[PDB]
Symmetry: C2
Subunit: 311 residues, 2 copies
């Protein structure tokens, strides 16, 4: 079965690490952190890895039940919630995944809305509530691999114990010094001092002059100063496509061309690696300034020795 990519322009793609549209392509060659995100991880022959799942609505989402309000040193009112799989089935900690699929894969204060629809009814319809909430993924109480996490609210009382609870992610609460936003630092999925397991592997350029190419989205902020971004290796639609197709990878590296369909011209070429990430021959950091109607077209299978035309 021939390998293919979807024909979706940048303006028709979404981020696989947060529910955002792709805003720009981006490079950062001098990045010192190990790039090992766990969402938006899929091999070219369609094997989902890390915490990656298929739903755009599942990325950085949680489902579960609030248990109780809990004490925390930090500002706000805090709540423990058990978490299930996104499909409602119990999360089995013995499954070979880092955490429930969809779990956030970076350190930070994730801002969103907690909503509840009660199990018990009264015209035999249940009571509901929703409030803004923050999940600090760096907190010692962030233990999704153990089946429970903690969130904080501004609301002090109107969160119900033992009721079905949904977290809808919206952005970040803050990127100030004490908010520990670092998109390449993984949460400790089982808690402080524990080793993460079953991780999707780190990615890096191997060839001289090459750097990773990211699909970048700017992420909203609840408050404060900043213009934070989330970089994914492949957009969610590519994850969905590769998973569907399951085309055998005929080498370790696919040559792809970024094409302008209006002119038919190649703007640049890139290596699409077997494990599901892109590299380009670029010697600068920052956005790739190109029209959003551009898209990657699969050209051919090459190998690690192939030399990319400089961007």
């Amino acid at each position: 079965k021939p390998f293919t990519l979807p024909i979706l322009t940048l303006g028709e793609l979404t981020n696989s690490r947060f529910p955002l549209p792709i805003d720009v392509l981006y490079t950062n060659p001098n990045e010192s952190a190990i790039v090992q995100c766990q969402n938006g991880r899929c091999t070219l022959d369609g094997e989902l890895q890390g915490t990656t799942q298929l739903l755009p609505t599942g990325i950085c989402a949680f489902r579960g039940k609030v248990t109780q309000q809990v004490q925390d040193e930090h500002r706000g009112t805090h709540w423990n919630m058990t978490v299930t799989n996104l499909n409602g089935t119990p999360f089995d900690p013995t499954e070979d995944v880092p955490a429930p699929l969809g779990t956030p894969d970076f350190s930070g204060q994730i801002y969103g809305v907690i909503s509840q629809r009660n199990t018990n009814t009264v015209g035999n319809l249940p009571a509901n509530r929703a409030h803004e909430a923050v999940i600090a993924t760096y907190s010692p109480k962030f233990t999704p691999k153990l089946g429970n996490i903690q969130f904080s609210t501004w609301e002090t009382q109107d969160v119900s114990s033992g009721q079905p609870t949904k977290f809808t992610p919206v952005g970040l609460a803050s990127v100030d010094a004490n908010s520990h936003f670092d998109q390449w630092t993984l949460p400790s999925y089982s808690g402080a001092l524990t080793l993460n397991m079953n991780l999707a592997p780190s990615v890096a350029p191997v060839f001289p002059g090459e750097c990773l190419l990211f699909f970048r989205s700017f992420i909203p902020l609840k408050g404060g100063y900043g213009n934070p971004a989330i970089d994914c290796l492949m957009p969610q639609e590519w994850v969905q496509h590769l998973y569907q197709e399951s085309a055998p990878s005929l080498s370790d590296v696919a040559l792809v061309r970024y094409v302008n369909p209006e002119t038919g011209r190649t703007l640049f070429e890139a290596k699409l690696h077997r494990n599901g990430f892109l590299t380009v021959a670029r010697n600068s950091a920052g956005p790739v300034v190109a029209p959003t109607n551009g898209y990657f077209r699969f050209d051919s299978w090459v190998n690690q020795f192939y030399t990319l035309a400089p961007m």
Copy 2:
């Protein structure tokens, strides 16, 4: 002729095309009295997007624009006038042949979400940000997205900035009480109440007796009050994306599809997938379709409109 195909996605791998929600169940309601003419999740089988349908899951019931004015409510809350652009940031051209900016909500109700802002201008050199819960009443006379402006209301009384880039992230509904006017099949008046909506995707209905529409149903969160509201779409967003990609020619007015259990390989039921992008089944009851979670629709063959479906 390029062969017609559907994605192989189970219900648990599909999302709603009319609100950012996972698909929870398949659903029928044969005695529905309303005209079904939703505008999101509309796509012909040969890949033509219709109504206000666009491809991004993040675009469904989303808005982008700038706040222009603060207006206090008489009783409670603050209202904010917002000019809206296309979701890609370009100016919305009201003369374009669409009902409203793509992504605009396609139903009457109080849509609950978060308005966020990231300022354009900066002596620190990082822009200021804010976000607050917000409600958009799509039935309101001030909901005129085809004219390029809407209004949202907040509990927050002051901290929303004018002239700054503004994003609406939908989350659910504010209420489904009587005075919240939730009706998933009542279209907003995109240009205001005395004006006719234009460029609409056509209404959908079964043509043959004994058939009813089959919906992909999602339950939508509530900010408060009692209720278990649901949003039914004609096709999931992944189907829209797939059909748009493939643009396979339609070889008849109807694609026969089978809902299959891959574990047994057995067909659970069959359905007509109509040219205009919707499903009908031979079922004479309302409610969820009880079917295994591993199930998915498989394209069988092109048939004729006169094809008689096996009763469910």
